[PDB]
Amino acid sequence: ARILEDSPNARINKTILDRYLSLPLQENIVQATYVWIDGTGEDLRCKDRTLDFIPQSPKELPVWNYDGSSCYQAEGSNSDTYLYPVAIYKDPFRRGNNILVMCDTYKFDGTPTDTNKRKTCLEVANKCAAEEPWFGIEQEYTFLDFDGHPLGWPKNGFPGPQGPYYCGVGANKVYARDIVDAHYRACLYAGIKVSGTNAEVMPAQWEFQVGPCEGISIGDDLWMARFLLHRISEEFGIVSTLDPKPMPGDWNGAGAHTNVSTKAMREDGGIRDIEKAVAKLSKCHERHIRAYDPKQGQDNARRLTGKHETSSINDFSAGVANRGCSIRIPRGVNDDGKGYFEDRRPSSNCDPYSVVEAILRTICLDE
Amino acid sequence: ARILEDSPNARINKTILDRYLSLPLQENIVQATYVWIDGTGEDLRCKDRTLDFIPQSPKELPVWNYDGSSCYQAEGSNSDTYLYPVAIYKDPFRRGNNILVMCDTYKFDGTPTDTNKRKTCLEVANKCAAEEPWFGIEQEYTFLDFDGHPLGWPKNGFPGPQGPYYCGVGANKVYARDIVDAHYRACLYAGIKVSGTNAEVMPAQWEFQVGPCEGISIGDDLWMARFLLHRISEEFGIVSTLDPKPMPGDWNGAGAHTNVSTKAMREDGGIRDIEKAVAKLSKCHERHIRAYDPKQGQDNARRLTGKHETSSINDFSAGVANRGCSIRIPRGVNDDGKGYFEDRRPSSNCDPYSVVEAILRTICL
Amino acid sequence: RILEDSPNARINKTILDRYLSLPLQENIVQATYVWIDGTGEDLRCKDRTLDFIPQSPKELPVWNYDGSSCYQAEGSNSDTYLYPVAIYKDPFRRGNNILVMCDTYKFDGTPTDTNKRKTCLEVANKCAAEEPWFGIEQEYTFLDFDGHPLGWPKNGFPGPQGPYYCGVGANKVYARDIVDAHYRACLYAGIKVSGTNAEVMPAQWEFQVGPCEGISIGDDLWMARFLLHRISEEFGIVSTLDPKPMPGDWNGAGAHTNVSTKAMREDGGIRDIEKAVAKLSKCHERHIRAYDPKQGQDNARRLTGKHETSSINDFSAGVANRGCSIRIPRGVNDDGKGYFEDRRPSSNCDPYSVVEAILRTICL
Amino acid sequence: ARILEDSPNARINKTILDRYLSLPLQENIVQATYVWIDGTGEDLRCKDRTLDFIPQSPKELPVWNYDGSSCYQAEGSNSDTYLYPVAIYKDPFRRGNNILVMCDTYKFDGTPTDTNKRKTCLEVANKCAAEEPWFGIEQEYTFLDFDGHPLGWPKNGFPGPQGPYYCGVGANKVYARDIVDAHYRACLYAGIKVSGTNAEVMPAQWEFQVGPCEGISIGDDLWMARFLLHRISEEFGIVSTLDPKPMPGDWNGAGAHTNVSTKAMREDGGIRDIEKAVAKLSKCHERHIRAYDPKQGQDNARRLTGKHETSSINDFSAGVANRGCSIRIPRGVNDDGKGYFEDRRPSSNCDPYSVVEAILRTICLDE
Amino acid sequence: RILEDSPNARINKTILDRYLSLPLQENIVQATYVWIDGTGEDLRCKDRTLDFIPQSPKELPVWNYDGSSCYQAEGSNSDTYLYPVAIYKDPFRRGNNILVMCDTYKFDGTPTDTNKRKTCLEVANKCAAEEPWFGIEQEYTFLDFDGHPLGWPKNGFPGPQGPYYCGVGANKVYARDIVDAHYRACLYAGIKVSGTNAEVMPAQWEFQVGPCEGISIGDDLWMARFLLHRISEEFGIVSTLDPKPMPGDWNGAGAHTNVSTKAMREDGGIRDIEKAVAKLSKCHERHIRAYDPKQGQDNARRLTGKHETSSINDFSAGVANRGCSIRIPRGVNDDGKGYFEDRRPSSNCDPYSVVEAILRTICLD
Ligand SMILES: Nc1ncnc2c1ncn2[C@@H]1O[C@H](COP(=O)(O)OP(=O)(O)O)[C@@H](O)[C@H]1O
Ligand SMILES: Nc1ncnc2c1ncn2[C@@H]1O[C@H](COP(=O)(O)OP(=O)(O)O)[C@@H](O)[C@H]1O
Ligand SMILES: Nc1ncnc2c1ncn2[C@@H]1O[C@H](COP(=O)(O)OP(=O)(O)O)[C@@H](O)[C@H]1O
Ligand SMILES: Nc1ncnc2c1ncn2[C@@H]1O[C@H](COP(=O)(O)OP(=O)(O)O)[C@@H](O)[C@H]1O
Ligand SMILES: Nc1ncnc2c1ncn2[C@@H]1O[C@H](COP(=O)(O)OP(=O)(O)O)[C@@H](O)[C@H]1O
């Protein structure tokens, strides 16, 4: 009755679309959905165009543009903002040779927009290329009803206390698995390396893991995966939020925990290299928590500095297999004496480009 | 409209998923769902990962972990808990080469968790192998709406008294058969030997039978089957509960009656062996009740009173084709001089590993 | 309001199809055993996984159920046995899956009170040389979960009879989808459903089975009944065989029974038809006793002589006449051969008892 | 929201009437409501007329008529049926000098209707005038919603089992006390001797007791109490039923237990006269059952099974302090050597005139 | 949704008034007899017409009821007797109409199992010399018809505790109308209600009765409970006295009892009190049995030692302290004299048993 009752998309018919989706087209014709990051640094925008050819590379896609003043990227008279494809994926909605196109964005003068964090991240990731840095990201998120309350939670109230929902199974334990399952498979079909999923501590809260991807491709892939989550959830009338505190107080906020390695760390006795990198990471702490947050640490501080599977934003701790510590070497990695380390500081709404750039600067470029 | 009105999963669209399900993936890509028992010893948990190969046995799969502090399996600062794969099944939700994996769980130091009953059962099952013991379990369960009241029952009250609902047919006799049929088929596809189903005495109450299964297999199989029931139910917005007394008073609680035979018992003249086994089980009643419910024989006490065709919690009686009993020999087993016997004591929420072990201890060791 | 409280109507209906397309290894066979309970009117069922494709009812195992849970308590040994009698293709699962009609037997091998097949079969076998054929017109009514006829205004009545019989239209007949699904399921299963029609009462319908030789009418009508209840379950709709599912001047329900022997079907058999009707005239009370499963109590509520119906007490029979106990149809009196129509059996009759009683009187 | 949703009277505004009730008229305008029993023998009918005078006794009221063919009292084309006042009460709905009139009925030729039982009862009661016989009746009844299900019961189902509802207090114990309380007060005001009320075993079930009344007046007063019950219930959209089994099974039926005493049973040593009457009623069980029911034993046969605190229809019994019997003599009476006896046979829908006559015929006219 | 299924909430409430206002001759008197049933928790009532105005209880007729219809079955001798023991003016009917508190007796003239008044009264008269005064703080909770606390989100919880205690506002306290109506109806009836407040738990409230001399605190509290249920009823809201109307870290329910003798109150002061207290430290186990009507089984649920309550095993005494079993209020300590607080009695206690036990231990040894 109440659940999704005001959500426009949940109330529109979902069956008719298949009639039109079945329509055969000249294989020549290609619909391309260009996706980009808006002025908030948090949200995605998209639009599409018809091509008459199958592109092999993002360089073969035309440069496009949008009204930056309609996306919180105003620039007086000169608000036309340009779209530079950087990465191509198969489209799981249209399936043909139809494609999704991640972009980065440039002002009219050829300079990056404020929210373009990929330009510099790429400079750096090229300059550490020889080190073959690999990143995994654990993206947490919460499903909301249209009124902003977490999906399925009683209106004007709370479901039972945490305990039964983590990795839960059952109608009273986890909600909207359908979307999670759809999204997992859509990401796979699109060529994004999602390595798994789980249900989180808060009911309506989930996680998917992406990686491991090399260098800057973790940013393109996570951004596209976010796009896909929002877009799939839209069809259901459900809002997916990346906000780190989608509900105040005792309930679990949201991280984007980031797993890192270089070729040396992955090699035999890389443990010493890891332990070195964590030391370096462990103290420049005030500098990273700024580029782990699209508003420079104001979002972080709603979730962080507590005792709910997180990290204190105040100070810094580096433990082994410690969910309480900002940066963490897993037990099996100590045991193996090689592998990777987990940075538990990035917030669910982090920009991955900023995260990897801060990381690489510190552990490869030697600041 | 009240039925399922507040169930989130029942209020979310169900046809969109099929679009995404039919997406074709490159081969190499396998989705594996790991499943384990949590610190309650009753409830299941699960999560997924992507593999780049097709495993051939459980041994080929990666050991994995979870946070036990989030599963009622806290161990201070060392809360990481380990998932060991013990059985693979085909995945009926995702099909193809996708798989479901039953696990057992270990603490950070390599010891079993309190609710891992399989390590100790596996040991005993292995000592008893040559007697080739076979187990079947009749798992009773009940469908609930989101508010915890049994599915389709009138809000704040009761349907008609017992009688019409057992093995029923008709819109006013039995509810949500679609889940039952979907589950029977899913299990069969998964490789679980579901041997039957029926609607039970209580409206919204049902049973599926698993077996016969070789030794430790009954435990892996029944756990995975329970998983499948919860997980299929979930899509409908419906809760499946294995609680033994999901409504109080004169409403049939729930059992997990266990059928047992050894090789001796299945060969001509087995009835002698069956007779002896029943004899031994009669001198250690209390120990079995304690292993026959995962809270030491306390959820056993809200059901096993000595009424509604059942055992008594304090009292051990056996008999030939007798349902007011603990241990029963079926008429057809007696008439054939060979076969299997029925242990009626275990409750719907028993851990099958514990039931098996207790039994094999008494009648093989 | 319509079906708002029917649990099965409120549960999602599209998810099942995802699990139904699940491919299983050839040779796994699901078998659903079906039986009549201690009311003598209602059906029960459950299912088992089999190893093999049975070639005939004898190849299937004997099973059991707890009689105490279906009004068949025999104190301390209530374990009741299920003997397969007929096998049908399963229209719900298809493949090699089957439904299995049974009859039922106590612990000591004697028949339960509601097993009327045993005794009917002895009689029908004795009459086999007369090749008796039976056709049955099974009437029924769809109900909402509250017991009120489906679609009828709550706490009230739709317009008077006239427009609904064999109707077409959203305001003339209800739930044809179940009717059409049943019709085809029955044909797929191997049941000889010869026709259907909408009846005089809105939400009321009829299916005809036959002609079937002997005992097989009984098996087949029972499985068709099971199929009706079972298909209508998935819609959340109750199908009742109650003979007077609403009181007043609203059409009750019959299971009119058409009957012929070898002699009656050959030219000049009309003589033998009249012989048979005459033997049935002389023992009216024993048939009305056989013609509902409480011995003449349920038919009384229908048989008022007013609504296309015969008298409770008084036996009558005439050509072309729907006010009579036993009617000889126009076409058959004209043709000099065919069958007679027995209009006495109520919609909740056991066809084994009906067959047996008619065979005893016209063949014995 | 279902309780009373389909009941027309519950869905009509209730405060508007007050506006019109407070309209003053001159004391000499009298509204008289004539009430009678219809051809079912169970239900009441009524209608109103304006008088210009205040009658002093039933003798002073006009004899009236109605169309019996609309009340199941057809008699072909001579269907005009006559209404003779026999009792007047003060009207608790209009107050002032307005009145309710209980009547009995008579066919066009002056002979009584089949459902007029008063006539032959009053013949009898007059011959027993000396014995000064008193009657109390314990009228059980059930409130139903408009769909025929008991008021407040879950639709298509049953509330919790019996036990908590008898003389209960609490929103989840008893329902519609306002009607019970209104009616009790309205009976008193109208001039009926209502001695008490209680909530009964079945939820939605209630009882009021009337008496002790002298002779024939028990009949007139109880029929008028009945009228008032339905007429008051009607306002709330609630149906009040006197059906003896308003729900089949292990749910308590409804009786009209009748307390009886003569001058002689009330004096010292009266108990001796009592045990003699019981014995006389014990010799003719089948006579009474037929007088105890608007048919002749048909509705009793659904209530009276032996269980649920009532006598068997088949055989008779006495005892003391026993609620399983037909005729109960209270303890407090045996102990005091005087009082009355309780006939527990009459069903809730009995016609009281029929109950009284049959009892008097037996215990006074020595039949 | 709130009160949507409560029959009394859905019945028109304005019509009754046009009937109550009807006038009747002055010595027509409606009397409502009130008694405790076989649970020893719940009340029952029924009513009769008198033709006179009673001056005291003894002028009312002894009456009876069917004990087998209220869990007071004694086979075929089930008629149970009502003895009037206290009269109150009737706030629902006004005029000379009355409410009658009774105690109950078997057919043989002996007290029913749930009459604690008879023995309580014996002891009270023996301690009359020492002029004992009692004050009781009765907590209770309002429930919707489904048993969920009134106004709480269906299938869930409101915000944590903090804002509700002594709260003001539509989102802080619920159903103040019932509380005000009860407060006043009690005062009019002759019951010495001395205050009320909204409790920690949302929908939870309290009223205080007393100080009352001796046995009358039991009569008066019982009749106040009656009034609460009966007023609640007209709104279609349930009032429960269950000590833990919701599980976990939501505030249970007490019936804290304040106590004094003449000594303790007249100047002599806290040395009489400190001795009285030390007499209670001796017998905790015995008092927990007197302090709910199943003898420790319901208390165990709110007496956790957590959420401002004492633990059910261990005894404790502190000044101005709220974690203790017995309490000396700072205010009484500061002064020569006063009363002491007993914080162990549970919301569903029988006050007659609370008084008796306190009096045996303290005025009698
Ligand atoms: N050597 C590595 N370097 C970087 N990332 C890795 C490496 N190995 C694994 N990862 C990635 O880290 C992520 C692990 O997330 P998850 O399984 O949720 O870990 P946990 O929940 O134990 O913290 C996965 O995407 C995985 O692919
Ligand atoms: N020899 C045997 N040993 C163990 N289990 C058996 C044996 N034979 C059959 N079983 C299993 O016993 C179970 C019987 O379940 P069910 O038909 O519900 O029995 P009932 O309802 O009569 O107790 C099924 O799992 C069946 O496969
Ligand atoms: N000669 C016959 N002998 C036995 N049964 C017959 C014969 N002819 C027809 N039937 C059966 O009787 C049924 C006739 O029912 P129906 O056509 O509904 O009759 P009506 O038109 O009078 O309702 C058919 O379903 C058919 O199987
Ligand atoms: N002497 C008497 N003769 C006839 N009826 C009496 C006499 N004394 C009292 N009564 C009536 O008996 C009835 C008592 O009924 P009730 O109080 O319900 O008792 P119980 O609890 O035994 O059913 C009242 O109608 C009362 O007026
Ligand atoms: N001397 C006394 N002896 C017994 N009871 C008393 C005495 N003085 C006050 N009381 C009663 O104790 C109750 C106090 O309850 P309350 O005001 O809620 O106290 P608190 O909430 O501070 O514990 C009141 O009914 C009060 O009348």
Coordinates of N, CA, C and O in Angstrom, one line a residue, chain D residues 3 9 11 14 24 32 88 104 174 185 201-202 214 217 229 244 256 261 274 278 286 292-293 331:
Chain D
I3 N -15.0 -2.7 9.6 CA -16.1 -2.8 10.5 C -17.2 -1.8 10.2 O -16.9 -0.6 10.1
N9 N -26.9 2.6 7.8 CA -27.1 3.5 8.9 C -25.8 3.9 9.6 O -25.8 5.0 10.2
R11 N -23.2 4.7 8.0 CA -22.5 5.6 7.1 C -23.2 6.9 6.9 O -22.8 7.7 6.2
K14 N -24.8 11.3 11.9 CA -25.6 11.1 13.2 C -25.8 12.4 14.0 O -26.7 12.3 14.9
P24 N -39.3 22.6 19.6 CA -40.4 22.5 20.6 C -41.7 22.3 19.9 O -42.0 23.0 18.9
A32 N -47.4 8.4 18.6 CA -47.5 7.1 19.1 C -47.0 6.1 18.0 O -47.4 6.0 16.9
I88 N -48.6 0.4 27.0 CA -48.1 1.7 26.6 C -46.9 1.9 27.4 O -46.8 1.6 28.6
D104 N -51.3 -6.6 20.0 CA -51.4 -7.9 19.5 C -52.3 -7.8 18.3 O -52.8 -6.8 18.0
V174 N -15.0 -6.9 25.0 CA -16.4 -6.7 24.7 C -16.6 -5.6 23.7 O -15.8 -4.7 23.7
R185 N -30.8 2.1 29.9 CA -31.4 3.3 30.3 C -32.7 3.6 29.5 O -33.7 4.0 30.2
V201 N -20.5 -15.2 26.9 CA -19.3 -16.0 26.7 C -18.7 -15.7 25.4 O -17.5 -15.7 25.2
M202 N -19.5 -15.6 24.4 CA -19.1 -15.3 23.0 C -18.8 -13.8 22.9 O -19.7 -13.0 23.3
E214 N -45.3 -9.3 36.9 CA -46.5 -10.0 37.3 C -47.2 -10.6 36.0 O -47.7 -9.8 35.2
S217 N -47.5 -9.4 31.9 CA -46.8 -8.2 31.6 C -45.3 -8.6 31.3 O -44.6 -7.7 30.8
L229 N -34.2 -2.8 21.5 CA -32.9 -3.2 21.2 C -32.5 -3.1 19.7 O -31.4 -2.6 19.4
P244 N -30.7 -18.4 18.2 CA -30.1 -19.1 19.2 C -28.7 -19.7 18.9 O -28.0 -20.0 19.8
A256 N -33.2 -17.9 26.5 CA -34.0 -17.0 27.3 C -34.4 -17.7 28.6 O -35.6 -18.1 28.8
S261 N -41.8 -17.9 39.8 CA -42.2 -18.1 41.2 C -43.7 -17.7 41.4 O -44.2 -16.9 40.6
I274 N -42.0 -25.6 45.2 CA -41.0 -25.5 44.1 C -40.7 -26.9 43.5 O -40.8 -27.2 42.3
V278 N -41.2 -28.5 39.5 CA -40.2 -29.1 38.8 C -40.6 -30.5 38.3 O -40.5 -30.8 37.1
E286 N -41.5 -32.7 26.2 CA -41.8 -32.5 24.8 C -42.9 -31.4 24.5 O -42.9 -30.8 23.5
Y292 N -41.3 -23.4 23.0 CA -40.1 -22.7 23.5 C -39.2 -22.1 22.3 O -38.0 -21.9 22.4
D293 N -39.9 -21.9 21.2 CA -39.3 -21.8 19.9 C -40.4 -21.4 19.0 O -41.5 -22.1 19.0
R331 N -28.6 -22.4 44.4 CA -28.2 -22.8 45.8 C -28.9 -21.8 46.7 O -29.7 -22.2 47.5

